[PDB]
Amino acid sequence: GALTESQAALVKSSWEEFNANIPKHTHRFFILVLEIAPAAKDLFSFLKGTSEVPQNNPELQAHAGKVFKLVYEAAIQLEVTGVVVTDATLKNLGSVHVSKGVADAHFPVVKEAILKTIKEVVGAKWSEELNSAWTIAYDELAIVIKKEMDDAA
């Protein structure tokens, strides 16, 4: 699809709609994770020892917001520039995933949980042209993190 001026306009618009409700969209995002894969729960310090996903845990919210911001920035950078740029942050990201016991096969888990989360966030505006656009941007960003984990291990 590329990333036409018209596709980019569509991701920006849909991310703005996401940030508009962090405690919701972030606790949703963790449940769609634990639905696609239950075991994933022992990984998270703030989920260990718990039974249910905490709803007002700042550690949890801060964590999940950073996740989506990073996917959106990726999409604009693709329409302007044509690419996703790897910086210090993405590199330290890769380290911390490895410490915590995260692998590649975990990533379609978190993608589906993010497409499903954005299809839920935009509702009737949803178009092929938009699904195509977030898919392009996540795939493009995951390519870059997975790269950095492999490197931290």
Ligand code: HEM
């Ligand atoms: C493009 C996709 C992804 C992005 C942008 C991303 C981003 C991040 C960030 C920014 C942090 C640190 C947050 C903090 O310091 O507060 C983090 C931590 C973590 N991530 Fe990810 N992530 C991605 C995919 C995944 C996947 C597939 C998994 C596996 C289930 C995962 C598991 C974790 C865990 C266990 C931690 C440590 C949390 C701790 O115990 O406190 N991430 N991730």
Ligand SMILES: [F-]
């Ligand atoms: F994460």
